[PDB]
Amino acid sequence: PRGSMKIGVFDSGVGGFSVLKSLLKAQIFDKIIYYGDSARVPYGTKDPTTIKQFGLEALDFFKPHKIELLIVACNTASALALEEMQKHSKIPIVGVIEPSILAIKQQVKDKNAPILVLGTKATIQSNAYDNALKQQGYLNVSHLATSLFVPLIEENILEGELLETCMRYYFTPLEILPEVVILGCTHFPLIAQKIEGYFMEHFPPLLIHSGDAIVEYLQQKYTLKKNACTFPKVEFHASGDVVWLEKQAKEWLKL
């Protein structure tokens, strides 16, 4: 319904490239300013106060770039900092949590369906996803903090016994067999097939992808046509070495 060209994308590091990939594939925006807090990544192992402050400082970064909409690609910042970012900023901020709730409403008509939330420690300890799902009447929601997937994925460990063992470590205690599996972390789309293949091979579920969900939400909220910019302009900024972050983008975006 609303109007809204130049976009910002905030993430703790290179994980947000999974959201940038969705944005770029949808071809909805012509200019995107990506900022990864790669000097301080990860956020998910840290405390709400630290993370909330990180989100507010991300706003200070974007202020000189005259963006019209800020996407918080980071599920951790979305879960912990979004409300504070919203109150301190004059521009719209859309996180990757709320859009996934809407996507589930649209894709999961069984309100009793087992749902499994995967995320960082901070995301899962916030109960952000559980609360929002309960508010929408879902009654059978489990959560699981798969902290070590982040560093594993960042070391390009996308297969093998070390990934399979880490999944065993985290998934084995699960009680309910999920019918929905929320990838509530920027990183986890890069192992989505393995996560689907684990729950199927040790007992596929509807995998909710945060990037795809935020894209669909933005089309509805702002009436944005796909294929409206064939080559969007993406600028990369980082608190750490920007060349390191741009080189990672080359890998994450061709994946």
Add this chain to the structure above:
Amino acid sequence: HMKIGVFDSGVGGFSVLKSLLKAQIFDKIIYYGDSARVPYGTKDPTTIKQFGLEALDFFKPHKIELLIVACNTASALALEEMQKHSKIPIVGVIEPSILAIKQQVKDKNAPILVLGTKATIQSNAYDNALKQQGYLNVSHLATSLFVPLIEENILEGELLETCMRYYFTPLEILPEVVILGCTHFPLIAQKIEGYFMEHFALSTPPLLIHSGDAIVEYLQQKYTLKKNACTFPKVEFHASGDVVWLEKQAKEWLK
């Protein structure tokens, strides 16, 4: 001299602090973990160098007479720059470990394996220091994933064993000495000894070089401090993240 600072990226430095407290050589210790920004090991030298200079600003109001850089990554990359901007002595954990090796490894051809973060290994600080002393049979191995595994309190079981098998299977030189060039690795020291004993059938394990024990000897000799003097040293904990969170980990790491 009397009141010292201890700097680490986070809670790993408790391995060095544990050594310092057991030796009972200092009366007052100001520990500072940059837990908002940990880890350093996956980041770039420029970022890490700046982290080291900012740590110096933290200790300025505390009026310390000595700063221990417990972090091997900051020691490898930031120590020299830190010292140039500092009016007090700064001691890292790399150079003292070379001295412990000079003292314990008379065979300069003994195979030595240095373990540390990617940034530490990439700096080659250990290899360069060891070469400078006549040690020719030297290998370096970045074991990045040990850090997040240890912080998740995974000090045993199959996930850790698979991770050691991931990093060690490629080793060409069966080491006689393993340098624990990372604050976290002492917590799996016995596991590292156990691995080599199993997968290479030895009776005695490699010599393990503990960074904290190395710096303790160095400091007692350098400042001629009396071991077992202060029976209950004073330790103040500060963090860039939630200091209660850092103090809770300290309880576990110091046990």
